[PDB]
Structure 1
Amino acid sequence: MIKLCIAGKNNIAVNSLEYILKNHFKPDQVAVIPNKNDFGVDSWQKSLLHYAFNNHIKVITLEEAYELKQIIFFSLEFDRIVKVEKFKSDKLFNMHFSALPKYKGVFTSITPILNNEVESGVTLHCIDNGIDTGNIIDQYIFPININDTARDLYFNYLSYGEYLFKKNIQRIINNTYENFKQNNISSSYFSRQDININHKINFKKTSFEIHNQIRAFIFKEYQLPSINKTKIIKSTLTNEFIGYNMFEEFEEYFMISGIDGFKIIAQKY
């Protein structure tokens, strides 16, 4: 019978399924539900469908997963909201790419940077009917480095999410894990509608904040930020004072300071 279903995408889903096959369950005991963006082609992330094809793993529908008693249903960047009443099993888990209760919703590789954070986290939690609302099983908090981009932060969510899965999965399989209700205080949420991918920079902001408005949108597979109709590939912040409210466009880079006058180099594409 199917003991475990991985729903989702990218190296966190593929590498977690690989860990299951080596340590826990046989191919005939697992199933996948790939994301709508999965066409079975490895690119800048591995395709869960391509892995399932190579490893003789069955694809199932959400409708089928509902009917499988005792299934461990694990979302690793699954693209769909499930209704937990529809499942016969109550063994429903998600890895969320933020330090819950902060930064529920989407674009979590943008929202912490854009909102001036110096740390983020990955959080293993029970699925309930809300978005990212379910009881916490485990959390790992890690730094946002001062010149990290959304892409760097994303790759960190991928590696820390994969680590936290491997840590907890035996205890999930043995039903010997605790869960804790999320706090109401410090709970925060961002929907697709809350992020403009073509963000217009506000320069009436600190250097840190102008930096953050650039680097939060550096994720080349999706987009790069533009200054004066010119793509930016990298932003570097230093504590060097060059004066307040500077803007100097050179051939290959902009030099920028905000209200507090610290040096930003925005590298052109």
Structure 2
Amino acid sequence: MIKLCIAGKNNIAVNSLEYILKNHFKPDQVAVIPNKNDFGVDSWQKSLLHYAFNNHIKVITLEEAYELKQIIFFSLEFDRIVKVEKFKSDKLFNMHFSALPKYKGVFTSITPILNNEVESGVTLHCIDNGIDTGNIIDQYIFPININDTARDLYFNYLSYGEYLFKKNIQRIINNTYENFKQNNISSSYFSRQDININHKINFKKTSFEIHNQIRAFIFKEYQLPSINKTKIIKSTLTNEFIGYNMFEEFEEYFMISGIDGFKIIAQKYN
């Protein structure tokens, strides 16, 4: 019988499945639900379907998972909203890429940088019918490094999320895990509508904030931001005072300061 389903994508799903097969269940006891964008090829992330091909793991549909009594359903960057009533199992779990209750919703590699955070986290929670609202089982809070891009933060999510899954999976299998109501205070949410990938930079901001408005959008597989129609691959915030509200194009980089006058080096793609 299928004891566990991994639904989702990327290194967190693959490496979590790997850890299951090494320590808990056999290929017959596990199934995958891939994302609509999985096409069997490793690239900047490993493919779940490719892992499933290599290890003889069967694909199921959501509808199939609904009817599997006492399946552990683990959502690891799964692309589908799930109604808990459809599931015969109530052992439904999700790894969300934020320090819940903050930064519910999407683009959580962009939203904390853009909203001036210096920390984020990964949260293992119970799935309920709301978006990232379910009861928290565990959480790892970690720094946003000052020059991290959205891509760096995403990679840290994948890594800490894998660690949190590994740490918690035994008590989830054994059904000896605790869960707690999420606080209503400091609860925040961003829908897709709340992010403009092409947003005009506001230069009437601090160096930290101009730097954030650039680096929140540096994620080359998706996009790079532009200044004067030139793509930016990296932004560096220094503590060097160069004067208020500076802007100078060199051939390889822009030198920028905001209202507090700290030097930013924005490296051009050219």
Give the deviation of 1:200 after TM superposition: 1.0
Question: What do residues 44-103 of structure 1 show as CA deviations (whole Å, max 9, x unaligned)?
Answer: 000000000111001000000000001000000000000000000000000000000000
Give the deviation of 1:199 after TM superposition: 1.8
Give the deviation of 1:17 after TM superposition: 0.2
Give the deviation of 1:36 after TM superposition: 0.5
TM-score of the aligned structures, taking structure 2 as reference length: 0.99
Question: What do residues 201-257 of structure 1 show as CA deviations (whole Å, max 9, x unaligned)?
Answer: 000100000000000000000000000000000000011100000000111110000
SS in 1 for 2:2: coil
Give the deviation of 1:6 after TM superposition: 0.2
Give the deviation of 1:192 after TM superposition: 0.7
Q: Does 1:54 align with 2:28?
A: no
* Mapped partners of 1:30, 1:248: distance in 2: 56
SS in 2 for 1:139: strand
* Mapped partners of 1:199, 1:126: distance in 2: 34
Gaps in structure 2 of 5+ consecutive residues: none
* Mapped partners of 2:140, 2:78: distance in 1: 20
Aligned length: 269
Give the deviation of 1:2 after TM superposition: 0.1
Residue in 2 aligned with 1:134? 134
* Mapped partners of 2:268, 2:181: distance in 1: 46
Give the deviation of 1:127 after TM superposition: 0.2
Residue in 2 aligned with 1:10? 10
* Mapped partners of 1:38, 1:26: distance in 2: 23
Give the deviation of 1:164 after TM superposition: 0.2
Q: Does 1:231 align with 2:238?
A: no
SS in 1 for 2:21: helix
* Mapped partners of 1:221, 1:39: distance in 2: 16
SS in 2 for 1:162: helix
Residue in 2 aligned with 1:172? 172
Gaps in structure 1 of 5+ consecutive residues: none
Give the deviation of 1:198 after TM superposition: 1.1
* Mapped partners of 1:219, 1:199: distance in 2: 15
SS in 1 for 2:102: coil
SS in 2 for 1:142: strand
SS in 1 for 2:239: strand
* Mapped partners of 1:79, 1:54: distance in 2: 23
Give the deviation of 1:265 after TM superposition: 0.4
* Mapped partners of 2:162, 2:116: distance in 1: 25
Question: What do residues 136-176 of structure 1 show as CA deviations (whole Å, max 9, x unaligned)?
Answer: 00000000000000000000000000000000000000000
RMSD (Å), alpha carbons: 0.4
Q: Percent identity?
A: 100
TM-score of the aligned structures, taking structure 1 as reference length: 1.00
Question: What do residues 102-160 of structure 1 show as CA deviations (whole Å, max 9, x unaligned)?
Answer: 00000000000000000000000000000100000000000000000000000000000
Q: What does residue range 66-85 of structure 1 map to in structure 2 within 5 Å?
A: 66-85=66-85
SS in 1 for 2:139: strand
SS in 1 for 2:134: coil
Over 3 Å off, 4+ runs:
none
